[PDB]
A paper describes a structure:
All three proteins share a similar domain organization containing an N-terminal transactivation domain, a DNA-binding domain (DBD) and a C-terminal oligomerization domain (OD).9 p63 and [name] contain an additional sterile α-motif domain and an inhibitory domain at the C-terminus. Both p63 and [name] share approximately 60% sequence identity with p53 in the DBD, and DNA contact residues are strictly conserved across all three proteins. To address the potential for similar [name] assembly, we solved the high‐resolution crystal structure of the DBD of [name] as well as its complex with the ankyrin repeat and SH3 domains of [name].
Crystals of the complex were obtained in space group I121 when combining the [name] DBD with the ankyrin repeat and SH3 domains (residues 891–1128) of human [name]. The most significant contact is made by the cancer hotspot residue p53 R248 and the equivalent [name] residue R268, which was disordered in the unbound [name] structure. Both side chains undergo rearrangements to fill the large SH3 pocket formed between the RT and n-Src loops. Comparison of the two structures reveals that the n-Src loop in the [name] complex is moved ~ 6 Å away from its position in the equivalent p53 structure. Although the binding mode of [name] is similar to that of the p53–[name] complex, we show that it requires additional structural rearrangements in [name] to avoid steric clashes with the H1 helix, which bulges out from [name] due to its L2 loop insertion.
Residue numbers in the entry:
A (entry chain B): 920 to 1121
B (entry chain A): 114 to 318
Write the structure that this text describes.
C-alpha cells in the first residue's frame, strides 16, 4: 500500500491534520482543489469534519466547491451540521451552500444531521431549519441559483449559476419543491433545492 | 420508435376500468372518466380492473409502460427521479429495480423489463382469469415518483399504456390514459374537470 504524496493528496491530508501553512502552499500546485478522493471526500470535507475553521475559511474564500457531495451525498454543510457547528454552518450558507441538498440513502438535509445528544444542537438545528423555512421570504424574497437549470416545461425559468432572483410564491401546500420566481423581466417555476440564500464564491 | 398509445379493444374486447373512485379530498387515488385521467398519491395502491369478452390465448401477458404525453418530451424514457432511486424507502428488499416508476403489488410473477434497444422500462404480469363468479381481473399498481419530481418526471405529464400481449410481443389489446401522481388527487380531479366542462361548453347540472 503506497502512500500518495501528489499535490491533491497533500492538500486533503493537510486539511485533515490542520497544517494551514502547508494548505496555503500546496493549493497553487493542484490542478483542481475541488476534486475528490475515491470516496468522494474533498479538502473542504476534511477541513469541516476535523474542525479546522481557518482552513474552512481559506478553502471556501479560494473558490473551492462548497456543495461537493461525497459517495453518500454528504456536503460540507451536512458535515458542519453533524458537528453542531452553527458558526461554520452560517459561514457556509453565506458562501453559497445548498440548504436543501439531501444525503442519498436517507433523504436528509444538513439540518437533520445535527446531533441531539451533543452540545450546540438547539442553536445549530434551529438556525438551519430556520433558513429552510425563511428562504424566499426573508431578505425581500431574494435568493440565488447555485446551479444552471434548463426548463422542461413552458412555465419554468432558465437559471444560470449565480443568477439573482426574487421569490413571488413558495406554495408550500401544492408542489413544495417548486417556487414562483422573478428573474430579470420573466416569471416561472424553479426548483428550490438548486437555490441558496447567498451565491457561490467564484 | 415511439411507443403507441392508441386504444385497441382487439379480438377479446380488452377493457381497463376503475372501481367507484372516491370524489373525496382524502382519496389516495381517483379516476376521471371525463378526462381519461388517473390521479394517484406516490407509492400508494391503485387497483386497476381488466375485462375481456373471451379468454385470450395461453401465455398472454399484460404490460404497463409510462410515456411522456407531450410531443417535445416523448423520446425521453419515464424513469424514477435520482433522489427516490437512491433512497432506502420503498427500495429495501423489493423485487422492483429502484429506477422503475410503475410497480405491480402482490404478484410474484411480475417482470420488470428494461429494453436493451429502446431503454424503455415497463412491468409485465401474466393474464389471469377473474375469480369464480367475478367479472374483472384486478391488478394492483404503484407509482413511485410524483409528476413534479425534479430530475424525474420534472412536472411533465405522462400516459400509462396498458397492453394485452402474446408471449412473442404481438398486441392483442391496448388502453391508455393520462397519469398524475400528486399530493391531492381528489382536489386536482375536481379542478381539472371544472376547467374542462367550462372550456368545452359541456352541459352540467
Amino acid at each position: 500500500m503506497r502512500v500518495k504524496f501528489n499535490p491533491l493528496a497533500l492538500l486533503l491530508d493537510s486539511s485533515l491534520e490542520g497544517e494551514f501553512d502547508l494548505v496555503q502552499r500546496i493549493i497553487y500546485e493542484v490542478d483542481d482543489p475541488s476534486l475528490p478522493n475515491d470516496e468522494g471526500i474533498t479538502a473542504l470535507h476534511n477541513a469541516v469534519c476535523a474542525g479546522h475553521t481557518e482552513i474552512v475559511k481559506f478553502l471556501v474564500q479560494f473558490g473551492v466547491n462548497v456543495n461537493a457531495a461525497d459517495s453518500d451525498g454528504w456536503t460540507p454543510l451536512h458535515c458542519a451540521a453533524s458537528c453542531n457547528n452553527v458558526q461554520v454552518c452560517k459561514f457556509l450558507v453565506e458562501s453559497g451552500a445548498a440548504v436543501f441538498a439531501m444525503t442519498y440513502s436517507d433523504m436528509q438535509t444538513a439540518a437533520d444531521k445535527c446531533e441531539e445528544m451533543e452540545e450546540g444542537y438547539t442553536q445549530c438545528s434551529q438556525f438551519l431549519y430556520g433558513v429552510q423555512e425563511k428562504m424566499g421570504i426573508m431578505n425581500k424574497g431574494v435568493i440565488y441559483a447555485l446551479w444552471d437549470y434548463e426548463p422542461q416545461n413552458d412555465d419554468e425559468l432558465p437559471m444560470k449559476e449565480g443568477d439573482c432572483m426574487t421569490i413571488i410564491h413558495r406554495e408550500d401546500e401544492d408542489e413544495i419543491e417548486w417556487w414562483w420566481a422573478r428573474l430579470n423581466d420573466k416569471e416561472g417555476y424553479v426548483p428550490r433545492n438548486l437555490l441558496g440564500l447567498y451565491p457561490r464564491i467564484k | 420508435v415511439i411507443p403507441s398509445n392508441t386504444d385497441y379493444p382487439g379480438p377479446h374486447h380488452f377493457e381497463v376500468t376503475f372501481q367507484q373512485s372516491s370524489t373525496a379530498k382524502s382519496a389516495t387515488w381517483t379516476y376521471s372518466p371525463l378526462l381519461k385521467k388517473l390521479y394517484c398519491q406516490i407509492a400508494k395502491t391503485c387497483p386497476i380492473q381488466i375485462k375481456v369478452s373471451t379468454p385470450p390465448p395461453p401465455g398472454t401477458a399484460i404490460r404497463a409502460m409510462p410515456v411522456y404525453k407531450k410531443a417535445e418530451h416523448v423520446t425521453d424514457v419515464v424513469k424514477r427521479c435520482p433522489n427516490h432511486e437512491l433512497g432506502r424507502d420503498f427500495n429495501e428488499g423489493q423485487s422492483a429495480p429502484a429506477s422503475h416508476l410503475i410497480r405491480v403489488e402482490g404478484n410474484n410473477l411480475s417482470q420488470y423489463v428494461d429494453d436493451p434497444v429502446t431503454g424503455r422500462q415497463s412491468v409485465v404480469v401474466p393474464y389471469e382469469p377473474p375469480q369464480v363468479g367475478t367479472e374483472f381481473t384486478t391488478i394492483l399498481y404503484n407509482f413511485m415518483c410524483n409528476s413534479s419530481c425534479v430530475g424525474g418526471m420534472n412536472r411533465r405529464p405522462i400516459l400509462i399504456i396498458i397492453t394485452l400481449e402474446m408471449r412473442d410481443g404481438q398486441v392483442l389489446g391496448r388502453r391508455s390514459f393520462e397519469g398524475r401522481i400528486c399530493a391531492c388527487p381528489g382536489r386536482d380531479r375536481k379542478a381539472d374537470e371544472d376547467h374542462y366542462r367550462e372550456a368545452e361548453n359541456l352541459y352540467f347540472q
